Design a protein around this ligand. Structure first.
Ligand code: SF4
Ligand code: F3S
Length: 106
């Protein structure tokens, strides 16, 4: 599975969903997650993320290991997103700010 981590929050560019062959991204108000059972690890999304927030599970940074379980949990409750849309209004002000998990919205 590929995993969306911290830098997506408050950015949510949605470029990643274009390239997904199996449509396994699920949408939250200010963040996206990958459903781990559905992802086929084709890795096509992680060049596309402008926030460089997507990682192969086995490459998730040590300080971001919570995101693996979080993607699994939230994928079950959020709606499937299959079309990209516009980025959040202020996405590049937040691009690269650290510690954005305290701002996640369910
Ligand atoms: S690795 Fe491939 S299948 Fe998994 S989320 Fe990214 S684009 Fe979709
Ligand atoms: S910012 Fe988030 S919405 Fe997709 S394009 Fe990067 S993982």
């Amino acid at each position: 599975a590929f995993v969306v981590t911290d830098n997506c929050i408050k950015c949510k560019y949605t470029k990643c969903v274009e390239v997904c062959p199996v449509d396994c991204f699920y949408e939250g108000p200010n963040f996206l997650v990958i459903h781990p059972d559905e992802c086929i690890d084709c890795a096509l999304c992680e060049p596309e993320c402008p926030a460089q927030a997507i990682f192969s599970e086995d490459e998730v940074p040590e300080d971001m290991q919570e995101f693996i379980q979080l993607n699994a949990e939230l994928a079950e409750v959020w709606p499937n997103i299959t079309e990209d849309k516009d980025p959040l209004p202020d996405a590049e002000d937040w691009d690269g700010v650290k510690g954005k998990l305290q701002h996640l919205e369910r």
